[PDB]
UniProtKB/Swiss-Prot annotation, chain A:
Gene Ontology biological process terms from the UniProt entry: proteasomal ubiquitin-independent protein catabolic process; proteasome assembly; proteasome-mediated ubiquitin-dependent protein catabolic process
Organism: Saccharomyces cerevisiae (strain ATCC 204508 / S288c)
Protein family (similarity comment): Belongs to the peptidase T1B family.
Other noteworthy facts: Present with 16900 molecules/cell in log phase SD medium.
Name of the protein in its database record: Proteasome subunit beta type-7
Function: Non-catalytic component of the proteasome which degrades poly-ubiquitinated proteins in the cytoplasm and in the nucleus. It is essential for the regulated turnover of proteins and for the removal of misfolded proteins. The proteasome is a multicatalytic proteinase complex that is characterized by its ability to cleave peptides with Arg, Phe, Tyr, Leu, and Glu adjacent to the leaving group at neutral or slightly basic pH. It has an ATP-dependent proteolytic activity. PRE3 and PRE4 are necessary for the peptidyl-glutamyl-peptide-hydrolyzing activity.
Highest taxon, organism lineage: Eukaryota
Record InterPro entries: Ntn_hydrolases_N (IPR029055), Proteasome_beta4 (IPR016295), Proteasome_bsu_CS (IPR016050), Proteasome_sua/b (IPR001353), Proteasome_suB-type (IPR023333)
UniProt KW keywords: Cytoplasm, Nucleus, Proteasome
GO cellular component labels: cytosol; nucleus; proteasome complex; proteasome core complex, beta-subunit complex; proteasome storage granule
Main location group: cytoplasm
Curated annotation (Swiss-Prot), chain B:
Record text on subunit structure and interactions: The 26S proteasome consists of a 20S proteasome core and two 19S regulatory subunits. The 20S proteasome core is composed of 28 subunits that are arranged in four stacked rings, resulting in a barrel-shaped structure. The two end rings are each formed by seven alpha subunits, and the two central rings are each formed by seven beta subunits. The catalytic chamber with the active sites is on the inside of the barrel.
Gene name, Swiss-Prot/TrEMBL: PRE10
Misc remark: Present with 12000 molecules/cell in log phase SD medium.
Family under the similarity heading: Belongs to the peptidase T1A family.
Subcellular location: Cytoplasm; Nucleus
PTM notes: The alpha and beta forms are probably products of the same gene with different post-translational modifications.
Identification of the protein by name: Probable proteasome subunit alpha type-7
Included stretch of the parent chain: 5 to 144 of 288
Function: The proteasome degrades poly-ubiquitinated proteins in the cytoplasm and in the nucleus. It is essential for the regulated turnover of proteins and for the removal of misfolded proteins. The proteasome is a multicatalytic proteinase complex that is characterized by its ability to cleave peptides with Arg, Phe, Tyr, Leu, and Glu adjacent to the leaving group at neutral or slightly basic pH. It has an ATP-dependent proteolytic activity.
Length: 233, 140
């Protein structure tokens, strides 16, 4: 039993027709102090999986090191490491899920919400969530913490049930994601403007975008707002 | 008297450990294997006897990787070599866990050395039936 100290806010994600998108800002908060600005919370494993983590950063760094170790270990006595016996997203997920559940069961949790995003070897899109309780679920969109409140409703407008997935292009999807990050930057006091985004595509492979910025913000109307009721000037 | 050769940690009157010497016979009896240091790396090769057409070629791999940067090859009792490589893997994980950097090759050498020597200290264990050639690239 613990309490989170350095934390990362939302991780948001959806699937489109050929793959999956996942994004998270670059902030490590310390309570209300916006402490650390260079924090990558998307962890690519192999070239078909990205693990995006929110919650306690020291725990994230632990999970990071676990994932490096899984790669090392799977490569041992394995001549098909970079082929048929590479790590699938489902393997990476089921492992983490196991860890997270055993850790809650020992009353000593990894204080995180995790989304594993990737493309399986038969091309199928993979998108699953696991948190500090060991709870798991899939949905065409998945977001953690704050994002579940504000990103999901936007992303669900685009993909709202399974049948919407083949209708959705990487352009439409990435746009939806980028817009959601801007909304979160407007309304989440624990968010940063800088963020990373990654696409895992069954044709294009893995694209990892770093140093993105929320652009195209509406603030102009702020000039017309004065007082809190009766004040005129 | 004699019987110096019947038990592992026992010094003979001339100061030798005969069981270790017998382990060396098991090695000599094995397949031939080599390593060649080059100007920026290392190369390992081994002979793989084909006992019959029945052995899937390319398939029974003998060289083993430790961590990401170390290769090992051995001649003798093969299962012994595996055991030694397993330990080498734990040993390198441990080092990386605590020190962050992947294990330097001389450091790694010694880890294997200390473990192998350990198995000539007691009569409740047999010595290793392999010689191992291994190496890699590190910080220097």
């Amino acid at each position: 039993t613990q309490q989170p100290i350095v934390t990362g806010t939302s991780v948001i994600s959806m699937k489109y027709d050929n793959g999956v998108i996942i994004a998270a800002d670059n902030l490590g908060s310390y309570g209300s102090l916006l402490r650390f600005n260079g924090v990558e919370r998307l962890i690519p494993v192999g070239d078909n999986t990205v693990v995006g983590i929110s919650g306690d950063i020291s725990d994230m760094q632990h999970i990071e090191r676990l994932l490096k170790d899984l790669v090392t270990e799977n490569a041992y006595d394995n001549p098909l490491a970079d082929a048929e016996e590479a790590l699938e997203p489902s393997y990476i997920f089921e492992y983490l899920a196991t860890v997270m559940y055993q850790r809650r069961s020992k009353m000593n949790p990894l204080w995180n919400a995790i989304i594993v995003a990737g493309v399986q070897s038969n091309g199928d899109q993979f998108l699953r969530y696991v948190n500090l309780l060991g709870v798991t679920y899939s949905s065409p969109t998945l977001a953690t913490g704050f994002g579940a409140h504000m990103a999901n409703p936007l992303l669900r407008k685009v993909v709202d049930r399974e049948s919407d997935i083949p209708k959705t292009t990487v352009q439409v999807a990435e746009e939806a994601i980028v817009n959601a990050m801007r909304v979160l930057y407007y309304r989440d006091a624990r968010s940063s403007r800088n963020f990373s985004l990654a696409i895992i595509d069954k044709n294009t492979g893995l694209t990892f975008k770093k140093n993105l910025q929320v652009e195209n913000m509406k603030w102009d109307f702020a000039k017309d707002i004065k007082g809190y009721g009766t004040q005129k000037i | 008297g004699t019987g110096y050769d019947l038990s592992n940690s026992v010094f003979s009157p001339d100061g030798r450990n005969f069981q270790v010497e017998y382990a060396v016979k098991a090695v000599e009896n094995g397949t031939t294997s080599i390593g060649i240091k080059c100007n920026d790396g290392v190369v390992f090769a081994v002979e793989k006897l084909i006992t019959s057409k029945l052995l899937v070629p390319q398939k029974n791999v003998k060289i083993q990787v430790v961590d990401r940067h170390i290769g090992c090859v051995y001649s003798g009792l093969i299962p012994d070599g595996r055991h030694l490589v397993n330990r080498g893997r734990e040993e390198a994980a441990s080092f990386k866990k605590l020190y962050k950097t992947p294990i330097p090759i001389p450091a790694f050498a010694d880890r294997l050395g200390q473990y192998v020597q350990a198995h000539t200290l007691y009569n409740s264990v047999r010595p290793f039936g392999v010689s191992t050639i291994f190496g890699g690239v590190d910080k220097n």
